[PDB]
Design goal:
This is part of a larger assembly, with one copy of chain A, two copies of chain B, one copy of chain C and one copy of chain E. By secondary structure, chain B is mainly alpha-helical. Chain B is built from four helices and two strands, in the order E-H-E-H-H-H. In chain E, 70% of the residues lie in helices and 0% in strands. The chains are: A mainly alpha, B mainly alpha, C mainly alpha, E mainly alpha. Chains B and D meet through strand 1, helix 1, strand 2, helix 2 and helix 3 of B and helix 1, strand 1 and helix 3 of D. The PDB classes it as hydrolase.
Amino acid sequence: SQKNGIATLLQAEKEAHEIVSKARKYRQDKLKQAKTDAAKEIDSYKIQKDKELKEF
Amino acid sequence: MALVQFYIPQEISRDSAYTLGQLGLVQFRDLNSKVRAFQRTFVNEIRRLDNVERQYRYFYSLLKKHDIKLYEGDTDKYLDGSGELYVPPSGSVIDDYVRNASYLEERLIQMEDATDQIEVQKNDLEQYRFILQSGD
Amino acid sequence: LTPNQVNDELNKMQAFIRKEAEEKAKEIQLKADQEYEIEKTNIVRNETNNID
Amino acid sequence: ELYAIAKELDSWFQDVTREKAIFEILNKSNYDTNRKILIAEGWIPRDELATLQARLGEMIARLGI
Amino acid sequence: MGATKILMDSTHFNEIRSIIRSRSVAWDALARSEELSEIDASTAKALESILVKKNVNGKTLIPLIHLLSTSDNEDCKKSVQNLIAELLSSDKYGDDTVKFFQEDPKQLEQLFDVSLKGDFQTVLISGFNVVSLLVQNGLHNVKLVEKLLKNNNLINILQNIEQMDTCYVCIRLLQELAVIPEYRDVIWLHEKKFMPTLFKILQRATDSQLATRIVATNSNHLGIQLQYHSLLLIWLLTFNPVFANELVQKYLSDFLDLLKLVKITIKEKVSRLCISIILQCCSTRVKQHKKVIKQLLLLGNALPTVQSLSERKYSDEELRQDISNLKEILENEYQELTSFDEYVAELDSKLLCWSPPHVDNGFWSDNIDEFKKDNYKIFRQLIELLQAKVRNGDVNAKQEKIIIQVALNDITHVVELLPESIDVLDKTGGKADIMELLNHSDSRVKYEALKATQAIIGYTFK
C-alpha cells in the first residue's frame, strides 16, 4: 500500500484543513454574533434603567 | 529516532530506498509535498534562502576583510571529526546564524574603516610632521 | 522498505496531522472566543456610559 | 575581532551550506515541485544519521534532525 | 448524554486509565475482606459489566460516589473513579451518568471529596471528573477550583516535573478550566506557585537538544503538547489587562526567555503561543502599556529578536500576523516616546540602556540642537556622568560597565555629528577617560571610545 498512503495522507490533510477552516469560520461567527450581542446586552440595561426610573 | 528527509523523483524511489536502506534507513514511505505541512511550498524558504545568501555574502565579505584565503566547506556529514563539531545533528536555525554574523560583519567593517582612516591620518600627520618642522 | 512500516508511518502521520489540526482549531476557537468577549465587553461599556 | 570571528565565519559557511541544502530540499519554488515531486520520510537512529549523511548519493539530499 | 471530549486526546490520562483498568481488583474480595461495602462492590461490578458489554445505568453511580467519599481506600476509589471517569469521559456509552451527575447537585460536592485524597491517580482522575462537571453549562463553582488549587495534593503532583502525565494533566485541567471567565479570576489569585514550573519546563526544553526521541521537553508529541498546554494556560489568562501588566512587571525576567523558544523550536505551535503572549501583552488594552513596552524593549530587547524571529515562516500565519502586529506596535510604541525627555530622564536617572531608536543618528542630531542651551550642558552632563562613574566607583565593573559603553557609544554619534563637542569634553575633563578606557578591559567599550577618539582625531587633523 505504497500508493495509497499519499492519497490517504492528502485526504487527512484536506480534512484537517477543512477543520481549521471550520474553526476559523466559527471564530468569525463568534465576533459576528457578538456584534449583535453588544446591542442585545445594551437593551437589557436600557430596559433596566427605564424600570429603575419608573419606580422613582 | 532522528527524522530524515529526502528529495528525488518518484521513478528512482526504489533505488534510493534500496541504496539508503543499506546505511541504516528503515520505514521508507513515499509521500508528496502537499501531504507534509512543514515540507510544503512557501515563500518563507525563499526568504530564508535569500537571508542565507546574504549570510554567504557576509562570510565572503568578512573573509575578504580578514585578509585570509577563501575557505571552502560544504561539509554536512557527521562521520568526520570536523563535520560533527562544525555541524550539529539537529535542525539549522538561519535566524541566529544571520543575526549572529550581521552585527559582527557591520562592526568589523566599521572597525576596518576606522582603522584605515586612523592609519591614513597617522600616515598623513607623520608624513607632514617633518615637512612642517623643516618648513617652520 | 517493509509494507507494514509504510502503513504504520502513514497512520502515525495522519494521527499527528489530525492532532495538530485539532490543536489549531482549539486555539483558533479560544482566540475567537476571547476576541468576541473583549469586543462584547467594549460595546457593553460603550452603551452603558450613554445609558448612565 | 578577526580572531574572534575567524572560526565563526568558517562554521557559518558550513551551516549556511546545510541551510541552503535544507531550503533546496524544502521545495520552496514551482520549478522544484515539477522536478522533484517525491518527498519521503523515515525513521533512522541518531548514530546511523551521521553514517547516512556520509554518502552524497546521486540526486537525493540528506537533512539532520 | 453527550459529554465533552476534554482529556480524551491525551495519551497521559489514557495510559494511567489503562494501567489502572488493567490491574483492577475485585470489589467482592475487598468487600469480603472488610475494606469496602458489598453494595458498592456489586454496583461497581454491575456498572463495570454494563459499561463494556452494554455500552437505569446512572442509578448505580450513586453508591460508588457515596462509597468513594465515605471510604478512605485509594484502591477502591481509584478503580471506581476510573470506571466512572471512563463512562463520563466517553461519548458512546454512559450518557445517563452525565445527566444524573448534572441533574443532582450533591453529586458534584460528593465527587469533589475524592479529589486531593488517596493516591495521585485517583486525585488526577477525580480532578478531571470534577473539572468536566464544572466545565458544563449547567453547574459552576469557583470554590471547588479555588479549594482544589489551594490544596497541597493537587499542586504537589503538578509541581513535580518527573511525571509528565500528572503535570500535563494538571496543566491541561487548569488550562481547560481557564477558558471560562469565572475561573480566570480565581486562577489568577493562586498563580504564584505553579507558574515557575511552566517557565522551567520551557527552559529545560530549550536547554536540551532537539535531535532526541525522548518525549519530556523535546519536540515530540508529548513535549509539544505539554509546552503548548503550559503556554496556552498563561496565554488564556493573558487576555486580562491587569494580569498582563502585573505578569509582565513581575515575571518579565522569566517572560523574556519565551522569545528564544520560538527561535530554537521548529514547530509553530510553541512559537505561535510565545509570540502571541508578547503580542497580547504588547497590545494597547492594558494600563501602562508604554512602560511595559519600554521596559521590555530597553531591558529585554525583544524588538531585535522579533525581527530575526520574523524571518522564519510556516503554517498558522495568524501567529506571523501577531508577530508583525507586535513588531509594528513595538516599533510605533518605541518611536512614539520623546527622545529629549527620555534621554534627559535616563541621564538624570544614572542608567543607560541601548535601543533601536535611541542609537539612531537622527535622534542625536535632532537633540543636539535642542540640547544646546548652556553650551552643551546635556553632553557635559553625560560626559560628567561617564567621567564621574568611570573615575570613582570601581570603573570597568558590572554596574558602570553598561553606562560607560552606552555613554561612549551614545557619545560617539554626538561626536561624529558635531565637531564642537571637543570643547565640552575638554572643559569637563572627559577626554582623558576615553584614552585611559581605550587601553583596558571591556574592549567593546574600548572600541566605542576608539571610534569616538577616531572621530575626534578625524576632525582634529585633516
